[PDB]
Write an enzyme that holds these catalytic residues in place. Structure first.
Site, PDB file in Angstrom:
ATOM      1  N   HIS A  15      -7.016   5.416   2.639  1.00 36.90           N
ATOM      2  CA  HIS A  15      -8.356   4.884   2.855  1.00 36.90           C
ATOM      3  C   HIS A  15      -8.784   3.960   1.713  1.00 36.90           C
ATOM      4  O   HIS A  15      -9.507   2.988   1.935  1.00 36.90           O
ATOM      5  CB  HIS A  15      -9.374   6.018   3.010  1.00 36.90           C
ATOM      6  CG  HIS A  15      -9.369   6.662   4.360  1.00 36.90           C
ATOM      7  ND1 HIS A  15     -10.167   6.226   5.396  1.00 36.90           N
ATOM      8  CD2 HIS A  15      -8.676   7.722   4.840  1.00 36.90           C
ATOM      9  CE1 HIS A  15      -9.958   6.982   6.459  1.00 36.90           C
ATOM     10  NE2 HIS A  15      -9.059   7.899   6.146  1.00 36.90           N
ATOM     11  N   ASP A 112     -16.710   3.970   4.875  1.00 35.41           N
ATOM     12  CA  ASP A 112     -15.381   4.476   5.187  1.00 35.41           C
ATOM     13  C   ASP A 112     -15.452   5.367   6.424  1.00 35.41           C
ATOM     14  O   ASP A 112     -16.406   6.132   6.590  1.00 35.41           O
ATOM     15  CB  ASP A 112     -14.806   5.248   4.005  1.00 35.41           C
ATOM     16  CG  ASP A 112     -13.295   5.151   3.926  1.00 35.41           C
ATOM     17  OD1 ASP A 112     -12.660   4.739   4.925  1.00 35.41           O
ATOM     18  OD2 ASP A 112     -12.742   5.492   2.859  1.00 35.41           O
TER      19      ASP A 112
END
Ligand SMILES: O=c1ccn([C@@H]2O[C@H](COP(=O)(O)OP(=O)(O)O)[C@@H](O)[C@H]2O)c(=O)[nH]1
Ligand SMILES: O=c1ccn([C@@H]2O[C@H](COP(=O)(O)OP(=O)(O)O)[C@@H](O)[C@H]2O)c(=O)[nH]1
Lengths: 456, 432
Positions: A15, A112
């Site tokens: 990520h 995110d």
């Protein structure tokens, strides 16, 4: 004008890497970027990548998100990266004063994907345009959007779930066998988190995806047409997200070994940054690498967190067994520069777990893949890669976390990968398309220009 | 909002590096940067560096300046780098349509010091704030501004505002020789520095003592443009290579036992001086990194040291802990790099502003400069005299202490609330 953009980060290199790459891409496209970090990171590689980015990009401001005291006993999973996500999500109501302090005023907050549910209202309270940074394939985003509706259609999710299919808008339907194994287990924190996030995706102004249109055929423009008609936020393909300059250290030991190898003769082998094979599978994979008859660059992990992988590889295999394997190919139990290895002309193929960053990196460098799914979205990602014609993926092998593949079987498929000419031909073709997408007038470069011009 | 700044480049690797480093510094301080380049460059180092900056900073835009056909018949000098300057200045009027076309609208034009007189009126046409990037020491800058009034009137000295007086012996050798293209520019430029909005000097306040504010107060009263201290100009990201052959050699050497020797990209030692510098390097009994610009002793030299006849990463060599000292020509870029990495230096002035810089380096307590050597272009030094001077350098602990002290003073200057950071922010907060 230079639109100020904030990045809300979460745990994991899977990520962080696209986050930092996109942050770099933004800054290079006349945007001011502020990354919202949290410490201490679960892994060391996370700490280094941030520091290196901040070092190479002094104009990128960092604001630390101090999380609330976390009681891991409350959470369902024992996964250090998933626990981190929840710790951030449980501290969601504290991001609001953090954002208001930021000067100059922000134009957009790029959230995110694991943090979408908890943090997309915080952006709404500030009248902040929010965008989801999706780190997996478009087919996975579509499933994660659809999966909440699917589980609500079942009385009991245990027995009524054989191996039927789950219909996906714009994509080939996904079998339950390709669905993340944790999804069968609702009441697992990972499942409950993605179910919530997939429900809240529609509340974002858009969804950033690390892909380009030529990769998925011509299905993307039609999907967005129907998405706009149904009042859903658009799929914003901005991939392939270019690796930063700090990701290239020209003098790495594995790179130097590759310089002494014939071009296209080396099989790179890695399974990501947060997963480790079982001791039995490691012993068998080593056997299969010798049987393959191919030069190999093998990256090994015995634990998920690098910090905790203190055991020498000797204790796992024995000094003799490990000494034997090093004669046939390069073996390292340490962090390596994947994309730098993948661009090396000696690398002819890639045995990967199916993580999207690695997959997209191989797409970008034109390396044929042998996708070996282990868990999560890697089977869905496997199918995407297969239809792209870049990779082969052995359905016979099932999940790596539930099925053991022995040495002989492993060696034969690596042979098949090294000699698969269609994959090689498509690799060169698909790579040139990825390049064209980010070049001016490209598909991805067009969408990114449209975003920035709206910000602005 | 991001202020758009245009960087006017001139030939000269000595002038290019600060320009490219200031261009990067601007981007890192939230500005859009457009550099004005001219091709073909005099040297490959220029072309390579410009390409590497554009490769590492995609947001920086390059607009080529096409010049009038130069007439190298006159050409009041035979220098390749200086000749291009006049070639640029001859076509100064051709910059107006280029600078106007640049979008988004420019906020400031940072123009390189050798072309100020010829390009400060170009900024006036565009209603653009003009800034001169001075590549030398602050002491040289005052000499440059005070010199034209001086020629309007040798062991004597020239009065300098804000500094110690400069002896004519430390003055550039070509300054005495009027009718030289170099001089004519410097005269014109010095008289034109007053027309610009600000003088950008690669320096920090602590290096020149607390005199910079007192100067600026005085400067402001007369209506003069302020001194903008933005140093040190840190090396760009492309100016660091994890493995070079020299760097690998330093890794096998004890900490601080290596003397680094470089005389810049432009200058070249005489054949006799090279043979003399070589024997002196052997006589010093020290380890050394020798950069040479233009067989039996070729093997002898490599025995106790490293010899290279090529472009090197100076700033990466100077960061290395193995390097204990710097035998430099005295170029302000090379000097400030040693300030940044806290490397004590033996200054050996060869030409131009290097005697001036040496005087600045001596007062800083960072270096020793041998007055008994004068100019390298004008004098030859035997090996015996060289080695003893290097030995004094390596054994000069007070130098090394002041070196480590200055690096911290330099590092704190670019940090938040630091000297250079404040003047930089204030400049961009006026553009704005
Ligand atoms: O030894 C390693 C392991 C990981 N990676 C990088 O870590 C990222 C992991 O991305 P992925 O999509 O595979 O997520 P993951 O499966 O690791 O969770 C990839 O971009 C790799 O380039 C790397 O550079 N070296
Ligand atoms: O072999 C060399 C010579 C020059 N430089 C660089 O070139 C610049 C030259 O600056 P200087 O002040 O010496 O100007 P010059 O006198 O060379 O014209 C310095 O910053 C050095 O970092 C270098 O990297 N390697």
């Amino acid at each position: 004008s230079c639109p100020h953009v904030a990045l809300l980060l979460s745990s994991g290199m899977g990520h962080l890497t696209p986050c930092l790459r996109f942050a770099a891409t933004l800054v290079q496209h006349h945007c001011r970027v502020t990354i919202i970090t949290n410490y201490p990171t679960v892994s060391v590689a996370e700490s280094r990548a941030i520091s290196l980015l901040l070092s190479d990009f002094p104009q990128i401001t960092e604001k630390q998100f101090h999380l609330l005291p976390f009681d891991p006993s409350t959470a369902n999973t024992t996964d250090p990266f998933f626990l981190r996500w929840e710790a951030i999500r449980r501290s969601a109501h504290l991001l609001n004063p953090l954002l208001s302090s930021i000067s100059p005023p922000l134009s957009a907050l790029v959230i995110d994907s694991p943090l979408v549910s908890s943090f997309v209202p915080v952006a709404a309270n500030l009248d902040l345009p929010s965008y989801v940074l999706f780190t997996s394939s478009t087919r996975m985003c579509s499933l994660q959007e659809t999966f909440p509706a699917f589980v609500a259609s079942k009385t009991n999710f245990d027995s009524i779930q054989l191996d039927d299919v789950i219909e996906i808008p714009g994509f080939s339907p996904v079998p339950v066998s390709s669905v993340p194994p944790d999804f069968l287990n609702l009441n697992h924190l990972f499942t409950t988190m993605l179910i919530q996030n997939g429900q809240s995706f529609r509340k974002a102004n858009g969804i950033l995806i690390n892909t380009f249109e030529a990769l998925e055929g011509g299905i993307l423009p039609g999907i967005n047409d129907k998405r706009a008609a149904d009042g859903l936020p658009p799929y914003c393909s901005v991939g392939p997200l270019l690796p930063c300059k700090f990701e290239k250290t020209e003098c790495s030991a594995p790179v130097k070994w590759l310089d002494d190898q014939p071009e296209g003769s080396v099989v790179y082998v890695s399974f990501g940054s947060r997963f480790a094979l079982s001791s039995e599978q490691i012993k068998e994979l080593g056997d299969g690498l010798i049987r393959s008859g191919c030069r190999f660059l093998w990256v090994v992990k015995c634990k998920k967190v690098d910090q905790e992988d203190e055991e020498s590889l000797d204790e796992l295999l024995g000094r003799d067994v490990l000494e034997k394997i090093k004669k046939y190919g390069f073996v390292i139990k340490n962090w390596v520069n994947q994309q730098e290895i993948l661009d090396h002309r000696a690398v002819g193929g890639f045995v990967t777990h199916g993580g999207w960053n690695s997959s997209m990196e191989a797409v970008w460098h034109g390396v044929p893949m042998l996708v070996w799914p282990q868990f999560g979205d890697q089977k869905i990602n496997a199918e995407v890669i297969e239809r792209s014609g870049l990779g082969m993926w052995v359905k016979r092998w099932g999940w790596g976390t539930q099925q053991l593949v022995k040495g002989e079987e492993i060696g034969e498929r690596i042979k098949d990968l090294m000699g698969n000419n269609p994959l090689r031909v498509r690799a060169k073709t698909l790579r040139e398309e990825a390049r064209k997408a980010i070049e001016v007038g490209g598909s991805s470069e067009k969408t990114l220009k449209e975003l920035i011009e709206n910000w602005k």
